[PDB]
Amino acid sequence: ACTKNAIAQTGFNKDKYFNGDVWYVTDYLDLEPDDVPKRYCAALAAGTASGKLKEALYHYDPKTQDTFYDVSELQVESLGKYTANFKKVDKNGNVKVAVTAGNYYTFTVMYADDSSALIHTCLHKGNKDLGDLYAVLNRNKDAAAGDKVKSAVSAATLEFSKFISTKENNCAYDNDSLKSLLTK
Numbered sequence: 001a002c003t004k005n006a007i008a009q010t011g012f013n014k015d016k017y018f019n020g021d022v023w024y025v026t027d028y029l030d031l032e033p034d035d036v037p038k039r040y041c042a043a044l045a046a047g048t049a050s051g052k053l054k055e056a057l058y059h060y061d062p063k064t065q066d067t068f069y070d071v072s073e074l075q076v077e078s079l080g081k082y083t084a085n086f087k088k089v090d091k092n093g094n095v096k097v098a099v100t101a102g103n104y105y106t107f108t109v110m111y112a113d114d115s116s117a118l119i120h121t122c123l124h125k126g127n128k129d130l131g132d133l134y135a136v137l138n139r140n141k142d143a144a145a146g147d148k149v150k151s152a153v154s155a156a157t158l159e160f161s162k163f164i165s166t167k168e169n170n171c172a173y174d175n176d177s178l179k180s181l182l183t184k
């Protein structure tokens, strides 16, 4: 179940966030913690591709080796708040699971600057969801969370001390695939 109406950043700068580049998840918190593993790797690219707002996602469970990519088309609900479809793809954008009614996620950018961000997502796959999931992002896959994004976590009435870090998993990412998937 999802329980939060995440508030988007006041003055969110969409062009900077959706610039075609990659964001790495450094830390995450699911309010239903058993919905996601305790060890995980994830990243995304976000950009406009031929006028369309897109995300490309990467998930990797470093223990099981379970790997999947997704291409998402985003619709705007309000500034910084989106509803996204998704199709599961290989790293080259070939479709494994097509866009499907009922497979979507909400995506809210609660805070962002040029290097760091705090997002909320509620994933739905038909009648199931994956709980309220918060993620701390950085442009640099190895960056420790600075005071700015930790402050945003506090401003959301959360505590960064409770987030689970992705940093001790040897995560390695295919940035080229994520960039190219924006077009697919």
Ligand code: HEM
Pocket (backbone or CB within 6 Å): 025, 027, 028, 035, 036, 037, 040, 041, 042, 044, 055, 057, 059, 068, 069, 070, 086, 087, 088, 097, 105, 107, 121, 123, 125, 130, 135, 166
């Ligand atoms: C737009 C940051 C993220 C977004 C938007 C997101 C979105 C998604 C989407 C769209 C799927 C379904 C993929 C498919 O079946 O084709 C998915 C699955 C999954 N995500 Fe995330 N995710 C994000 C971050 C994470 C993180 C950080 C964790 C735990 C850094 C996580 C754990 C999972 C798990 C375990 C699944 C599998 C669910 C299942 O088997 O039903 N995700 N995610």
